[PDB]
Amino acid sequence: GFFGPICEIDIVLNDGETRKMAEMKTEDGKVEKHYLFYDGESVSGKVNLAFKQPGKRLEHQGIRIEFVGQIELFNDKSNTHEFVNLVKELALPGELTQSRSYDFEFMQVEKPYESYIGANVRLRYFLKVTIVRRLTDLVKEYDLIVHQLATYPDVNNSIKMEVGIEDCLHIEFEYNKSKYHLKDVIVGKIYFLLVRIKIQHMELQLIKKEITGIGPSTTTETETIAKYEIMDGSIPIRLFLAGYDPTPTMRDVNKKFSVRYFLNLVLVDEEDRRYFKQQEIILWRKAP
After folding, report:
1. What is the CA radius of gyration of the chain?
2. Is the distance from CB of 183 to CB of 242 less than 8 angstroms?
3. Which segment of the chain is annotated as a signal peptide?
4. Cβ contacts of residue 120 below 8 Å, gap of 6+?
5. Burial letters for 241-262: b for 16+ Cβ neighbours within 10 Å, e otherwise?
6. Is residue 42 within 8 Å of residue 126, measured between CB atoms?
7. By CB neighbour count within 10 A (0-12 exposed, 13-18 middle, 19+ buried), where does 285 fall?
8. SS3 74
9. Which residues contact 60 (CB under 8 A, 6 or more apart)?
10. Phi, psi torsion values for 140, nearest 5 degrees
11. Do 103 and 209 sit in the same domain of this protein?
12. Do 37 and 125 form a contact (C-beta atoms < 8 A)?
């Protein structure tokens, strides 16, 4: 809110009217809406600097606009990795005396990673206007969201996961895929191969792990996205992802950040003993 009464910085995209706005659920329980972009698309528009009152001035050492793709870690070192930064100088040192607008166009912009808002990390893209000044610079950011579309073979090669303790409990879970899209469905069955104990309560879990930092600084957030009970006392299984709106798997993004999903089979007996097994599955976003 610096110099609000004097002037306003407004950033406007040339093609906003026909460009969709994606939503991103932040943890604060809020919902952000920003224009959706894809890798390779051009980013162009205008920067409007409008004076509200007459006879006012703003001395500066230059004005520019940057397109920024950033991975920001929320640790004590505030580790930030800018994987993309395009700059366009808009004005040389001088002073703003009257409302002015500047056109800009970043062409065929590389946006290699999908946007992400996590617990200890966020990967975001944004336009940033900076008016350099002797004291604090005036800055205006304009957030954009980037989705990454993919396509896989979609083969039907089942997968097997085994749980238990030898000569006590042996369970097998066979599901149809290694990879699923955000609205896909997981299909499989839990075969019992030996039950020397009393199966009190068991369930299939869809677990999310967000890994940040590296070395002695490696942080990990684990969240359960879905529980598929089967408790009770050869049981088919069908789990619909659409109902949870997960985010895609993000792996080859950066040495300091990954998001992976895992299927977790948990079995507990009357004696309260826990038998578990975990296997990773890859979630991806399918083109319309």
Report:
1. 25
2. yes
3. none
4. 73, 74, 75, 210, 212, 213, 219, 221
5. beeeebbbbbeebbebbbbbbb
6. no
7. middle
8. coil
9. 91, 93, 94, 95, 96, 131, 132, 133, 138
10. -135, 125
11. no
12. yes
Q: How far is 263 from 237, CA to CA, in rounded Å?
A: 13
Q: Resolution (in Å) of the shown entry?
A: 2.1
Domain CATH code at residue 86 = 2.60.40.640
In the PDB record, what is the listed experimental method? X-ray
> 169: Cβ–Cβ under 8 A, 6 or more apart, which residues?
163, 194, 195, 196, 197, 199, 267, 269, 275
The residue among 151, 185, 201 that closes a domain is 151
Return d(Cα 204, Cα 231) in angstroms, integer. Answer: 10
Q: Do residue 119 and residue 241 come from a single domain?
A: no
The maximal CA–CA distance of the chain, rounded, in angstroms, is 88
User: What sign does the CA torsion over 85, 221, 217, 276 have?
Assistant: negative
CB burial string 15-26: b at 16+ within 10 A, e below = eeeeeeeeebee
